[PDB]
Copies of this chain bind each other. A is one copy, B any other.
Amino acid sequence: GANKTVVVTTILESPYVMMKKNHEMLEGNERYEGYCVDLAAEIAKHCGFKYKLTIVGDGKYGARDADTKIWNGMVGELVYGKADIAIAPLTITLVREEVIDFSKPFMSLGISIMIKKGTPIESAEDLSKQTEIAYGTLDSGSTKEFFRRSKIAVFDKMWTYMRSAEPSVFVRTTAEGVARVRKSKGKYAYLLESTMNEYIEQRKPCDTMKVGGNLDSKGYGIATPKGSSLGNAVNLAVLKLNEQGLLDKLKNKWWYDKGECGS
């Protein structure tokens, strides 16, 4: 059949996808900017397709409801045919690989700890051994599932705390978690992916920092519906852009060239 505009699902997450300053006066894909906006343009060019960026309807990454078995977020939009490809900071996980296809990773990351500067915390073990400082995760993503499923002693203890903590320690968006770190003044630490942590560390008011090593090691992938013909070309495009140094260029562009906390 004739070529057709590719529906891209993505998510408003800085610096991956952000509304341009003058977005109210702009239309279509020009409303948005960021790492994944640049990446979408490069993938489309190499694969030779036109595309339309759309923000995932429920603003979620993707989880399977245990009772109804329904997928939400960007994963759901792929599973149920509402989008042709997801170009976002979407983590490659076993449960997702079973229902959608993933390119080889375009970015590496791991779960990490964000603290308000001066917080007496250096590690996940530190967090698990105390109760003065609360901590939590994004409410429906791969980080929360990591703790839910972990059988590692320290991470198991953290999950037991987080799942029952009052008031809730989970947040609906990364921005809410950052905000809670900043205004709790050392009494909340946020568990999030090192990429987003490192980005926020370079943003004013420059009052947070990443502490300790990463808790795990994983990657983001471009996702397509299982068996989609688009998957092969997209995977080769990712590998080409990585070897060309383009992915490194985009990381430096959106994380550090634009750093607001000094050189």
Binding site for B on A (CB under 8 A): 92-94, 97-98, 102, 104-105, 108, 146, 149-152, 216-219, 221, 235-236, 239-240, 242-245, 247-248
**CB-nearest residue of chain B to A240:** B94
Q: A105-B105, A108-B217 are in contact. Are A243 and B94 (CB under 8 A)?
A: yes
Q: A94-B236, A94-B240, A243-B94 are in contact. Are A219 and B149 (CB under 8 A)?
A: no
Q: A94-B236, A235-B97 are in contact. Are A105 and B219 (CB under 8 A)?
A: yes
Chain B proximity of A84: nearest CB distance (Å): 22
Q: A216-B248, A248-B217 are in contact. Are A239 and B104 (CB under 8 A)?
A: no
Instruction: List the B side residues contacting A247 at CB < 8 Å.
Output: 217
Other A-B contacts than A98-B236, A151-B244, A217-B248, 12 sampled, CB-CB below 8 A, are A92-B104, A92-B239, A93-B239, A93-B243, A97-B104, A102-B104, A104-B104, A104-B105, A108-B217, A216-B242, A216-B243, A217-B242
Q: State whether A104 touches B240 (Cβ < 8 A).
A: no
User: In the assembly, how many copies of this chain are there?
Assistant: 2
10 shortest interchain CB distances as A-B pairs: A94-B239, A94-B240, A108-B108, A152-B245, A97-B239, A94-B243, A92-B104, A94-B236, A108-B217, A97-B236
Instruction: List the B side residues contacting A92 at CB < 8 Å.
Output: 104, 239
Q: State whether B94 touches A219 (Cβ < 8 A).
A: no
Q: State whether B97 touches A243 (Cβ < 8 A).
A: no
Q: State whether A146 touches B217 (Cβ < 8 A).
A: no
Quick one: which of A152, A221, A239, A245 has the most chain B CB within 10 A? A239
Chain B proximity of A195: nearest CB distance (Å): 12
Instruction: List the B side residues contacting A235 at CB < 8 Å.
Output: 97
Chain B proximity of A78: nearest CB distance (Å): 17
Chain B proximity of A141: nearest CB distance (Å): 14
Instruction: List the B side residues contacting A149 at CB < 8 Å.
Output: 243
Q: List 11 A-B contacts (CB under 8 A).
A: A92-B239, A93-B243, A104-B105, A104-B219, A108-B217, A146-B243, A149-B243, A151-B244, A216-B242, A216-B243, A217-B242
Instruction: List the B side residues contacting A218 at CB < 8 Å.
Output: 242
Chain B proximity of A234: nearest CB distance (Å): 12
Instruction: List the B side residues contacting A93 at CB < 8 Å.
Output: 239, 243
Quick one: which of A236, A242, A243 has the most chain B CB within 10 A? A243
The distance in angstroms between the C-alpha atoms of A27 and B124, with both chains bound, is 44
